[PDB]
Design a protein around this ligand. Structure first.
Ligand SMILES: *C(=O)CCCCCCCCCCCCC
Ligand SMILES: *C(=O)CCCCCCCCCCCCC
Ligand SMILES: [Cl-]
Ligand SMILES: [Mg+2]
Ligand SMILES: [Mg+2]
Ligand SMILES: [Mg+2]
Ligand SMILES: [Mg+2]
Lengths: 230, 195, 212, 196, 226, 204, 222, 125, 195, 196
């Protein structure tokens, strides 16, 4: 048993017709102090998977090293390490899910909520969630922390069920993700304006976007608000 | 205090009440009477926290005796039981509630019927053919459900109570030093001096 | 949970209820609280359902291994003590079982052992175990004799559970009867309390407080 | 919450953010924490919104009744009424208030009233959770008898840094200028103060 | 509880869901969470159901007496001030969280009130368990100079976000539109997107299925003449 | 310890075609110990019926209190109180004890004498009103009653059909609760006749 | 302090027919007042004509199902590809659950299939491994809403034959697979109305001698 | 200070007259004429707006007052006494009825509450 | 369990031990023998937490019986008491201590002397002329202080024990269902079947 | 405790105060919180003195044994050894450590290791109780590729403000300069830095 010290907030993600999008801001909070402003919380694994991690950053850096070690280990005595026997999103997730549940069962959890976004060998979209309790679930839209309360409602208006995924383009999906990140910046007291976004498409592969900013923000109406009533 | 029983038969109500007063690790008295006569044809047995039991019983007694003098009339057992319940129902939301459970055994001279009322310290009233407070009921209700007959005579009822005392003396851990038995009927209240 | 067992000239009578609860919720009215270890060994179950089921079935495995190794039926004393010694190892861990081990052997005759998760092991003639034990004790103690007929003893056991099923809120469902003799136990049927109550009330003239 | 008040040559300026947070959720992102108790006596509210709102309303009532009998009250008088409520009810209140006012006789004055209910007259005051990060900056950069434009820059820069490091502070930077000229409201949006 | 308030050009519109729940169980499938303080001042409540209803009635009563005393139509700021000073006095123990809206001679107004007595001013507000789902929709689609038709659409969409994505909120959408120089229109069950489907089976029993012990006529009438 | 589940017991109310039904179990207990199988929880003040579950001392107290208030109401108004008006009186009465509440789950049932409209209402312990069209449930087996009512109930049942539905709803709910049962009563209420039926049920 | 347990809501229902068994469960997965997934399968085909669902804390539920499926695999390896009978599976699951007696799986477990005589079988487990064969069992959040309805409509409890007035009980006639699926659907529709953690979708696994068939139905998404 | 008039100012004279009530009725007799007529489908109450000065805006002085949405009142006698009675009548309609029963009082019961207030001024200290 | 007494007279040790076994609110047995024979001339009575009492007594019994067979020799009461004390002194600093208080009544055949040892669950040993465990001593020691004579005979010793049991039955709240009395002398151990 | 490390053109500088407090008592007023784990790898110790002292000693041992086998370790390597101790023993440690070192290849590097045991490579780092008051000042005044004299002034001014507002921080300002030229120790006394 511990308490999280340096923390990362919401990770948001959704499926679209040809793949998955995942996003997470670049903040490492220290209680109410917005301490570290250059923390990457999306960690790519090969060219077909991105692991988005929220919660304790020290435990995130440990998980980052496990995934780095997993790639190394997979390559050992593996002539098809960059082909048929490359790491799948499903393999990476199941490994993490095992570790998370093992750690919670020893009463010494990795204090994180994780979303593994990727595309499988057969081109199928992979999107699944796991947390410090080892609880796992999949959905057309997945979000952690505040994202679950604010992002999911907005992303579910785009992809409400499985049949909406083939109808959703990468432009519509990315637009919805970027809007959700703005809404979280308005309303989450532990969010930053700066974020990273990753697209894993079955055609165009992994597109990793860094140093994105929340823009087109509405504040002008604030000038008209005077007093707390009278 | 510990065990108080009540049984309503054909023509009378019988109250049995333990004679043992135990404070701490010592049994101070083995001849205690845990009852007060509220009116000539109404008896109330009581058990609960020390001091509160007697203080409450005597307070009720005084109030009913005051009513009797003012109206030159005896209240029905139902009326007395309703007065007692209201006092306990008032008491439970007081600064320091009365921690007292009572049985009210009365003979209604108007209806020519015995009546037994069981009231706990919360002010929970029920009219019963037979009742108990505390752990007494756990042992005795199985015997009473099995052997109780509404047309039973007082002597038959007295014998039935004897079975209940023996079961309690066998299976209860605490030595309650036997019971004082009192009968309430049309002729008033009398104590069975040999039990 | 209400369960009992008593010794008389006819043999041993074992009567249990069939109700299991989780809080005020009634989980099941179909629960079996008697465990058939072998033809002459019966185990009652009270407290934790898991703890009783798991360990009393395990006891049956230990009793089978004994008679494989010793070419002889295990004594009720030995069988009861295997269970009491086991639960004593787990003392403090939070095991919640109160059981009766009822059996008949040549050397012992009819024997009942009260075994307890606190490590208590008592031999005796009458035992009532569970939330409704006090209600069952009332009927038993007033009607028990050594000179009962197998028929009358079976009824007393059935009636004592019914008494508890009525009053104890955490006891009820149905009554399972067993009769243990020199030639083993004999099951005497599942008796629904919903039908048994009205039947006993009418025939016996008891329960005059209820209206039917 | 990041609030501050600075005295300058022409009078006094009140500066505050617009973020009110429940836990880590932002209940209101456009709050007004600069409140009027008299025409040229304002206050900055930190701590429990319910407690600070309740207190400010009582003071505005007291100074309105004061004015009806004895004419315009001094800033010191207004601070004394705040103190009396905060000190006497210290067990039941969570309110850190900065009182800032402009007289013609006394000019710009600033009084800070922390949790205890003590009064401190200062050339400038900073309060709320955000303040802790700008004690170093404000001490180094504050000068007495600054111009209006310098004081606006001082508050804008100070609050921007407080907003940057405090999770509980954010939104717009509201400011209220108190001078002989009258009462001027200023607002500064994230796009302006974040790039400082 | 998923209630919202949205300001528009000529007035303020407030909307709320219709689900009342005790613990995880749904006690009221169609509960009305929109209360009237006065004819043109309406409020929606969240938190302790008894407190929200009770506090509204008290202030609504005192607002009516105040309106008669002053010979003036009541103001939203009067309702707001009376609510906040009452709630503040009871130190949050009256678990009433309200969105107060209305039109009066001063104009159209939209406020929020918390149990501790803190109040907020805004063009769009959301309160309750689903407030985060609702506020997400409001923050995405709200703009300045909304029409009446746009504000009703935005308000109901914000309630729907709560209905679908929050367990605490559900069933139907209630709306009340308060426009300047017009009667307030209360739109009870404005949307009904949660009608239960027809059951597979009828559970109507054959008459005489239940076992009866006794029958008797109950005397509800008074003591009779003659 | 929890006052609402010391004594135990349940009340259910349903609307039918030009009729209402209110039913209750007869059990009063001290936790595990069954004490009384004649503790009725349904009372009536004129043509308005009130069922009360929860702590038995408060059930008795409130019955005596509403008899008191409806009797004065009738002397002053020169007419019997109506279900809609009585519902408001119960709510008012419960909420005045906001910070010292009665641990009860009241249920109002009756037909408005003037409009002829069937009416049911439920309350929480501090007097929040629940005015359902279909049915109201209360007591220790409220979860069980909700499940029974939600599946069994259909609108516009005839008095003698409604009797079967509410009876099966109560009985099967009570049989899945340790602190409910020991007998049951069902009131079938029409505009100018009320039938009271005692149900035969398992006594464990 | 770290709480190692959680509540993922959901509700499951097992009904044993005469020559078939059904194990149904809603597809909604939740924490507190948030929906995690509208379609997260809860009832699993474990092989050997056995279906299983461990409802409650989903992490412990998935862990148990995974370990049982593993037990079926090793039962084949160790005992010459012998079919694991439903009674043998039930006893095996008791040991899996009781194995963690002092750090339990926070789940209500139900398995369904056919016994060795080809009759419909349902087994019900508490979190610490006490089990019992049953004709009918609802588990999870809305179990308290569904079980009384099943006592009434499957076992005809408190129902009697008209004209006799309480003397003759309604006879316990056997229900067809079409009749059971109607009661399952009405149980989950009713549970969805009055329980906030129940809804989205209903997935039913039907077990016969022919094998395991699946049926899916929409539930209300509020 | 303190109100040291804790004794009745209205008392029975030897003849059995309550002087102050008789004198109050004399004050009513001097008052401007007001009337009421009951129809089958309504009631009408009317009075003369006796303007004290032509500079005075007689619209601001309401002799006919709404007590509840379905109850109205008019008077003859001392206007100020009427004004405070309307204030008390409106408030008692809420405190002693609407906040209990959730509906406005029937005419006769509101009249009864007003009557009670006027009786108490006839006996109180 | 509850009351265990011991008295060492001229030529014997007498142990009295209650017969009641009460779990919760019910007396499960009224004929329980709270003693084990460690050797032909050594008896140990015991009282403490349920399970631990019998488990400890039988464990000691087995160890002394093992010593007796190995050496073909009976250990002195002093030697047995020292062995038992060490086991309890070891036990008190264990993960889960034995919650058992014992009296060891033995006749030393070498010295031709009766010996009574009182040992509590901490491993506190004292040799006494008369001893008790729990609340027994509070009532009985005043009587024994008065009437105890070292040279008194076994018949005299039994009466003094009856006076102790009578006082306990009068003033103790718990019904301990009488006592089983056992005498340890030169001829070994025997039970007084009428007491 | 006020500690910080700044990277500049010629290398890196470590800055710290000299105050160690038990409660409100000053146990030591001339503490050395700049400690050597290697010739040109130093660290700044904040939190439990016992825990930070214990950890530093272990690292110095690890880097001494590293050097004997594999030659001079990188600053990144030294930070990794600190992290491994701080992260794996996070339940039993209260240590906030800033690791600062000079390579010839990498030049001046700064790694901060807060309570959690996470690693953050930064252009400059501030830690300890005093730091909270100089987030605003340090952010506004820090530039990359400063001169030695500018970096000494930046640390001296920053720590002086931190010392001024933090009760737990005080005494002398110690500094250690890490460049290609070697290792230089600086000290600045109250009379010097208080008048800034
Ligand atoms: C809704 O279902 C009830 C919400 C009301 C909460 C207030 C209950 C007050 C209980 C008083 C606590 C005293 C218990 C001994
Ligand atoms: C019937 O009574 C079954 C009881 C099952 C209890 C399950 C307990 C689950 C939570 C226990 C928490 C343990 C913490 C280490
Ligand atoms: Cl140090
Ligand atoms: Mg029962
Ligand atoms: Mg929902
Ligand atoms: Mg001793
Ligand atoms: Mg200092």
């Amino acid at each position: 048993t511990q308490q999280p010290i340096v923390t990362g907030t919401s990770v948001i993600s959704m499926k679209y017709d040809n793949g998955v999008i995942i996003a997470a801001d670049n903040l490492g909070s220290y209680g109410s102090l917005l301490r570290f402003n250059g923390v990457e919380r999306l960690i790519p694994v090969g060219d077909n998977t991105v692991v988005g991690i929220s919660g304790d950053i020290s435990d995130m850096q440990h998980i980052e090293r496990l995934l780095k070690d997993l790639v190394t280990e997979n390559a050992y005595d593996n002539p098809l390490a960059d082909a048929e026997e490359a790491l799948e999103p499903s393999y990476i997730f199941e490994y993490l899910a095992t570790v998370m549940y093992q750690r919670r069962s020893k009463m010494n959890p990795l204090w994180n909520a994780i979303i593994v976004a990727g595309v499988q060998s057969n081109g199928d979209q992979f999107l699944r969630y796991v947390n410090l309790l080892g609880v796992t679930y999949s959905s057309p839209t997945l979000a952690t922390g505040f994202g679950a309360h604010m992002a999911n409602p907005l992303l579910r208006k785009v992809v409400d069920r499985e049949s909406d995924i083939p109808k959703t383009t990468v432009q519509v999906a990315e637009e919805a993700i970027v809007n959700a990140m703005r809404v979280l910046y308005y309303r989450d007291a532990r969010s930053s304006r700066n974020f990273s976004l990753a697209i894993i498409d079955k055609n165009t592969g992994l597109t990793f976007k860094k140093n994105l900013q929340v823009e087109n923000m509405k504040w002008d109406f604030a000038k008209d608000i005077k007093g707390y009533g009278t | 205090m510990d065990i108080i029983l009540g049984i309503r038969v054909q023509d009378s109500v019988i109250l049995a009440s333990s004679k043992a007063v135990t404070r701490g690790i010592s049994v101070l008295k083995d001849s205690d009477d845990k009852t007060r006569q509220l009116s000539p044809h109404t008896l109330m047995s009581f058990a609960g926290e020390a001091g509160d039991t007697v203080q409450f019983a005597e307070y009720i007694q005084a109030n009913i005796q005051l009513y009797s003098i003012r109206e030159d009339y005896e209240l029905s057992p139902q009326a007395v039981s309703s007065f007692v319940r209201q006092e306990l129902a008032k008491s439970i939301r007081s600064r320091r509630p009365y921690q007292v459970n009572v049985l009210i055994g009365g003979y209604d001279k108007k209806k020519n019927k015995p009546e037994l009322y069981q009231i706990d310290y919360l002010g929970t009233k029920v009219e019963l053919p037979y009742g108990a407070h505390g752990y007494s009921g756990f042992y005795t209700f199985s015997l009473l459900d099995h052997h109780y007959r509404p047309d039973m005579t007082t002597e038959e009822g007295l014998d039935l109570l004897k079975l209940c005392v023996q079961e309690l003396e066998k299976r209860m851990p605490m030595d309650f030093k036997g019971v004082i038995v009192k009968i309430v009927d049309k002729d008033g209240i009398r104590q069975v001096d040999d039990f | 949970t209400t369960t009992l067992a008593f010794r008389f000239q006819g043999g041993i009578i074992v009567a249990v209820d069939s109700r299991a609860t989780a809080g005020n919720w009634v989980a099941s009215q179909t629960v079996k609280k008697v465990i058939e270890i072998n033809p002459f060994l019966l185990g009652t179950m009270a407290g934790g359902a898991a703890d009783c089921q798991f360990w009393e079935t395990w006891l049956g495995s230990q009793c089978r291994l004994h008679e494989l190794r010793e070419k002889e039926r295990i004594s009720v004393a030995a069988a009861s003590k295997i269970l009491s010694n086991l639960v004593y190892q787990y003392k403090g861990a939070g095991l919640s079982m109160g059981t009766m081990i009822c059996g008949y052997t040549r050397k012992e005759g009819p024997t009942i052992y009260y075994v307890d998760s606190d490590g208590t092991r008592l031999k005796g003639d009458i035992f009532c175990v569970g939330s409704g034990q006090t209600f069952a004790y009332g009927v038993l103690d007033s009607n028990y004799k050594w000179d009962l007929s197998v028929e009358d003893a079976l009824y007393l056991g059935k009636r004592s559970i019914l008494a508890a099923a009525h009053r104890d809120a955490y006891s009820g469902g149905s009554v399972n009867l067993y009769h243990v003799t020199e030639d083993g136990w004999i099951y005497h049927g599942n008796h629904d309390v919903g039908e048994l109550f009205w039947k006993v009330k009418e025939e016996e003239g008891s329960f005059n407080n209820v209206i039917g | 919450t990041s609030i501050m008040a600075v005295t300058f040559k022409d009078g006094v300026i009140l500066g505050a953010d617009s973020r009110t947070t429940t836990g880590a959720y932002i209940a209101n992102r456009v709050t007004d924490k600069l409140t009027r108790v008299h025409d040229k006596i304002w206050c900055c509210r930190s701590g429990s919104a319910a407690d600070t709102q309740a207190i400010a309303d009582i003071v505005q009532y007291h100074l309105e009744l004061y004015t009806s009998q004895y004419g315009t009250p001094s800033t010191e008088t207004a601070a004394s009424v705040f103190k009396e409520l905060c000190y006497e009810n210290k067990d039941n209140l969570t309110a850190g208030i900065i009182v800032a006012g402009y007289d013609d006789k006394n000019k710009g004055e600033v009084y800070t009233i922390p949790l205890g209910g003590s009064v401190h007259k200062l050339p400038y005051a900073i309060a709320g959770s955000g303040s802790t990060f700008i004690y170093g900056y404000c001490d180094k950069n504050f000068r007495e008898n600054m111009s209006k434009e310098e004081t606006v820059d001082f508050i804008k820069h100070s609050l921007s840094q407080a907003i940057k490091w405090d999770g509980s502070s954010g939104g717009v930077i509201r400011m209220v200028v108190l001078t002989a000229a009258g009462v001027e409201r200023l607002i500064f949006y994230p796009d302006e103060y974040e790039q400082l | 509880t998923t209630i919202v308030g949205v300001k528009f050009n000529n007035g303020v519109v407030i909307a709320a869901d219709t689900r009342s729940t005790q613990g995880p169980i749904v006690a009221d499938k169609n509960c009305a969470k929109l209360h009237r303080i006065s004819p043109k001042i309406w409020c929606a409540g969240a938190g302790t159901a008894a407190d929200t209803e009770a506090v509204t009635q008290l202030i609504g009563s005192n607002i009516e007496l105040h309106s008669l005393y002053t010979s003036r139509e009541p103001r939203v700021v009067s309702a707001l001030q009376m609510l906040k000073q009452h709630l503040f006095k009871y130190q949050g123990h009256i678990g009433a969280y309200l969105i107060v809206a209305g039109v009066d001679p001063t104009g159209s107004h939209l406020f929020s009130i918390h149990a501790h007595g803190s109040t907020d001013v805004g063009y769009y507000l959301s309160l309750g368990s689903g407030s985060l789902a609702a506020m997400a929709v409001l923050e995405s689609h709200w703009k300045q100079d909304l029409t009446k038709e746009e504000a009703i659409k935005l308000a109901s969409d914000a309630i729907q976000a709560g209905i679908w994505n929050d367990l605490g909120s559900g069933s139907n959408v209630d709306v009340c539109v308060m426009e300047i120089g017009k009667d307030a229109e209360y739109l009870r069950n404005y949307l009904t997107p949660n009608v239960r489907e027809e059951k597979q089976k009828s559970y109507k029993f054959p008459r005489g299925t239940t076992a009866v012990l006794k029958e008797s006529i109950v005397n509800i009438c008074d003591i009779q003449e003659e | 310890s929890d006052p609402s589940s010391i004594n135990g017991g349940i009340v259910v109310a349903m609307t039918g075609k030009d009729c209402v039904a209110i039913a209750c179990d007869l059990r009063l207990g001290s936790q595990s110990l069954g004490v009384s199988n004649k503790f009725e929880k349904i009372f009536h003040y004129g043509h308005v019926f009130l069922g009360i579950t929860g702590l038995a001392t408060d059930v008795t107290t409130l019955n005596e209190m509403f008899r008191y208030k409806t009797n004065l109401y009738k002397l002053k108004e020169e007419r019997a109180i109506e279900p809609e008006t009585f519902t408001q009186l119960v709510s008012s009465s419960l909420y005045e004890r906001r910070f010292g509440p009665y641990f009860v789950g009241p249920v109002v049932a009756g037909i408005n004498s003037k409009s002829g409209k069937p009416f049911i209402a439920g309350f929480d312990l501090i007097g929040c009103i629940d005015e359902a069209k279909d049915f109201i449930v209360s007591g220790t087996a409220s979860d069980q009653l909700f499940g029974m009512c939600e599946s069994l109930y259909e609108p516009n049942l005839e008095p003698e059909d409604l009797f079967e539905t509410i009876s099966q709803a109560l009985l099967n709910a009570a049989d899945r609760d340790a602190l409910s049962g020991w007998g049951a009563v069902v009131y079938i209420i029409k505009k100018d006749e009320v039938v009271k039926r005692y149900l035969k049920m398992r006594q464990d | 302090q770290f709480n190692p347990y959680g509540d993922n809501g959901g509700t499951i229902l097992g009904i044993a027919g005469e020559d078939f068994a059904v194990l149904a469960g809603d597809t909604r997965n939740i924490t507190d007042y948030s929906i995690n997934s509208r379609y997260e399968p809860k009832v699993f085909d474990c092989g050997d004509n056995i279906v299983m669902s461990a409802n409650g804390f989903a992490a412990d539920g998935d862990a148990l199902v995974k370990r049982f499926k593993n037990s079926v695999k090793w039962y084949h390896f160790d005992h010459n590809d012998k079919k694991l009978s439903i009674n043998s599976a039930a006893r095996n699951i008791q040991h899996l659950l009781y194995g963690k007696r002092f750090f339990p799986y926070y789940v209500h477990t139900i398995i369904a299939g056919l016994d060795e005589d080809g009759k419909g079988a349902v087994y019900s487990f508490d979190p610490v491994g006490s089990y019992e064969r049953e004709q009918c069992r609802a588990g999870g959040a809305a179990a308290s809403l569904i079980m009384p309805f099943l006592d009434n409509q499957v076992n005809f409890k408190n129902q009697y034959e008209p004209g006799t007035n309480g003397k003759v009980k309604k006879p316990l006639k056997y229900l067809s697979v079409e009749e059971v699926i109607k009661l399952v659907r009405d149980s989950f529709t009713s549970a969805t109305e009055r329980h906030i953690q129940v809804g989205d979708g209903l997935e039913i696994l039907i077990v016969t001698k022919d094998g395991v068939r699946k049926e899916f139905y929409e539930l209300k998404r509020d | 200070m303190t109100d040291r008039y804790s004794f009745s100012l209205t008392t029975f004279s030897p003849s059995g007259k309550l002087g102050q009530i008789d004198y109050a009725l004399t004050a009513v007799k001097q008052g401007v004429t007001s009337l009421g007529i009951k129809a089958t489908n309504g009631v009408v109450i009317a009075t003369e707006k006796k303007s004290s000065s032509p500079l005075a805006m007689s619209e601001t002085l309401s002799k006919v007052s709404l007590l509840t949405p379905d109850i109205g009142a008019v008077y003859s006698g001392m206007g100020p006494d009427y004004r405070v009675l309307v204030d008390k009548s409106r408030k008692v309609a809420h405190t002693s009825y609407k906040r209990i029963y959730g509906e406005y009082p029937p005419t006769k019961l509101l009249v009864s509450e007003v009557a009670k207030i006027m009786q108490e001024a006839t006996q109180s200290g």
